[PDB]
Design a protein around this ligand. Structure first.
Ligand SMILES: CC(C)c1cccc2c(O[C@@H](C)c3ccccc3)c(C(=O)O)[nH]c12
Ligand SMILES: [Zn+2]
Ligand SMILES: [Zn+2]
Length: 232
């Protein structure tokens, strides 16, 4: 009924949308992994009479439910998707998207890592993002590679029309007391990567983490803080 939806409020297999700004939504779904249930976010950005999707809903059936929820609530077609790193909460569901006719994209790094992991693989490579600090336009968003953080390949997404910064899994929510799933992280580089984000997007008004509640720019420093406390 209005607040941002949390893990215990979303059965696995259901998807919620949350309006962030004019023409910008997050999507929220839950999934079981190693015997625990976690929420995760993605983004939807209106692209004229089409939609750009950022990240899957963490699984095939969740991603099918995402497409159905989009049709119910927005009623515009998803024509392109970008996955912001290679983990299943970002690419799991790409095959569903691809068969629905959505053109799926990720950096070459992400595609390689997804393939090596046995995860689903976006179709098209996003060039121009291989060096930290790189930025490219993609429809109504800018894609930015901040450097290694939560993963070596993680991308962030900015929506200039709305000053929305989607940090993906490189950015943690304010309530987080840990650094999440760090199996593929670079904890030593992560704070430098966050600094690059902070410097590049000083006008961001909303910051959306890969998991949990959006907030403001404080999420960026908080992320550096929780990573530093994990590394220590
Ligand atoms: C490798 C993927 C599929 C995965 C599986 C299971 C859990 C995670 C996870 O912990 C997230 C949910 C998290 C962030 C902060 C505090 C606690 C937890 C993350 C993340 O931090 O991005 N990724 C997860
Ligand atoms: Zn991840
Ligand atoms: Zn994640």
């Amino acid at each position: 009924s209005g607040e941002y939806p949390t893990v215990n409020e979303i059965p696995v297999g259901e998807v919620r949308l949350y309006q962030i700004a004019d023409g910008v939504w997050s999507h929220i779904a839950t999934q079981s992994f190693d015997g625990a249930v976690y929420p995760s976010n993605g983004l939807i950005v209106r692209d004229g009479d089409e939609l750009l999707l950022i990240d899957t809903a963490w699984g095939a059936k969740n991603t099918a439910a995402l497409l159905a929820e989009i049709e119910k609530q927005i009623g515009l077609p998803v024509t392109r998707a970008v996955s912001t790193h290679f983990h299943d909460d970002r690419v799991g569901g790409v095959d569903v998207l691809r068969a629905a006719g959505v053109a799926t994209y990720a950096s070459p790094s992400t595609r390689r890592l997804a393939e090596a992991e046995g995860n689903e693989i976006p179709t098209h490579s996003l060039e121009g993002l291989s060096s930290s600090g790189d930025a490219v336009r993609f429809g109504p968003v800018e894609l930015f590679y901040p450097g290694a953080a939560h993963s070596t390949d993680n991308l962030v997404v900015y929506v200039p029309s709305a000053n929305v910064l989607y940090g993906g899994c490189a950015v943690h929510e304010l309530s987080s007391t840990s650094a999440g799933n760090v199996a593929d992280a670079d904890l030593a580089e992560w704070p430098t990567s966050v600094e690059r984000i902070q410097k590049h997007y000083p006008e961001a008004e909303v910051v959306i983490p890969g998991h949990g509640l959006p907030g403001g720019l404080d999420l960026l420093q908080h992320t550096a803080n929780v990573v530093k406390a994990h590394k220590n």
